[PDB]
């Protein structure tokens, strides 16, 4: 009964079905997903539809990379729904292993499934990419991995943070701007740095990422609250404001809506901004596609989460009385 006012997706990638086939083989081949309950549970998430709705510009092997990257995010995420997420030092050490892969230390044969899957996603991501994209996205991955242990610290504390501290942890553990870096890469575009760092596009990028993680906070609250998770916008608002759950959900909707309004107000300025910078027609085309990538990510993430089984299913198939996975795939 919660709708954030986002438009339905203007399009879906035509590669959904082909990518479903690729990604099913990929998660099994890497050892990221097993057979039986884990495979049925993974399948019920519909990672291919997340990729096709979230990245409608992606075609062919580009959409495959989007789905595999999402597969890594979601499988790796769930490994912390258990003792690992209550052990910050252990989480930090595991995440340092993954961070070493970001910065050039490939894992080698026989690495664990999470290390091997990440290394494959990261190698495919950087192949042929602009060095400015590689440097930025490498730092985005570092933030994602490094933030996990702080979520665990907050779990042990047992109170939500203030809004500023919530944003610092939650933006990291949500994957920071990685979905947009992935969408840019999958669309085959390179945002000119002069446009990328405009105040309008910097604010818009931040707003779009906040929109999707906050939409997720509302839909994933039931499975997260029961596990003692603290970095969820609804819990943060309730704790800060001393309000009811309904009032906190309504306020969370408002945090999303005001960011969508800001994004759309600034998007109106993007044609003029490109003219002021004297960008070439091709540069302007890449900026226009970047705008579409951001718009499609916001609408597509939400379209996916309304139809997936991940959020309605989790409390029943992986109750909070046990770990949030059927198989351990991340050695700690
Ligand atoms: C690590 N989490 C599984 C993240 C992965 C990326 C993402 C992007 C937007 C909204 C929610 C999420 C869940
Ligand atoms: Mg999670
Ligand atoms: Mg998480
Ligand atoms: Mg969530």
Swiss-Prot record:
Positions that bind Mg(2+) 1: 77, 81
Cofactor or coenzyme needed: Mg(2+)
Cofactor note text: Binds 3 Mg(2+) ions per subunit.
Pfam families according to UniProt: Terpene_syn_C_2
Ligase found in the keyword field: no
Stored InterPro entries: Isoprenoid_synthase_dom_sf, Terpene_cyclase-like_2
Single annotated GO MF: terpene synthase activity
Membership in a protein family: Belongs to the terpene synthase family.
Its biological purpose: Catalyzes the cyclization of farnesyl diphosphate to avermitilol.
Protein name per its UniProtKB record: Avermitilol synthase
Species per Swiss-Prot/TrEMBL record: Streptomyces avermitilis (strain ATCC 31267 / DSM 46492 / JCM 5070 / NBRC 14893 / NCIMB 12804 / NRRL 8165 / MA-4680)
């Amino acid at each position: 009964d919660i709708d954030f006012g986002l438009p339905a997706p203007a399009g879906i990638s035509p590669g959904l079905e082909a990518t479903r086939r690729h990604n099913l083989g990929w998660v099994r081949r890497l050892g990221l997903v097993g057979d039986g309950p884990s495979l049925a549970w993974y399948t019920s998430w519909d990672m291919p539809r997340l990729a096709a709705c979230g990245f409608p510009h992606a075609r062919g092997a580009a959409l495959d990379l989007c789905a595999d990257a999402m597969a890594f995010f979601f499988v790796f995420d769930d490994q912390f729904d258990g003792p690992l997420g209550r052990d910050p030092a252990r989480a930090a050490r595991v995440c340092r292993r993954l961070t070493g892969i970001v910065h050039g230390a490939g894992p080698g044969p026989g690495a664990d499934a999470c290390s091997a899957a990440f290394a494959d996603v990261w190698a495919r991501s950087t192949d042929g990419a602009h060095p400015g994209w590689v440097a930025r996205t490498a730092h985005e991955w570092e933030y994602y991995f490094a933030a996990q242990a702080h979520e665990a610290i907050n779990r042990l504390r047992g109170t939500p943070g203030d809004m500023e501290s919530y944003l610092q942890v939650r933006r990291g553990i949500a994957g920071t701007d990685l979905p947009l870096s992935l969408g840019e890469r999958a669309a085959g575009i390179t945002v000119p740095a002069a446009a990328f760092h405009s105040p309008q596009l910097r604010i818009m990028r931040e707003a779009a990422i906040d929109v999707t993680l906050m939409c997720n906070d509302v839909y994933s609250l039931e499975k997260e609250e029961a596990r003692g998770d603290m970095d969820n916008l609804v819990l943060v608002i309730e704790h800060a404001r001393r309000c009811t759950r309904d009032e906190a959900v309504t306020a969370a909707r408002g945090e999303v809506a005001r960011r969508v309004i800001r994004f759309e107000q600034l998007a109106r300025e993007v044609p003029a901004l490109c003219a002021q910078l004297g960008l070439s027609a091709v540069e302007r085309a890449h900026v226009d596609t970047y705008l579409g990538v951001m718009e499609a990510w916001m609408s597509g993430y939400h379209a996916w989460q309304t139809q997936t089984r991940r959020y309605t299913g989790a409390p029943h198939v992986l109750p909070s009385t046990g770990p949030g996975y059927f198989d351990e795939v991340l050695p700690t």
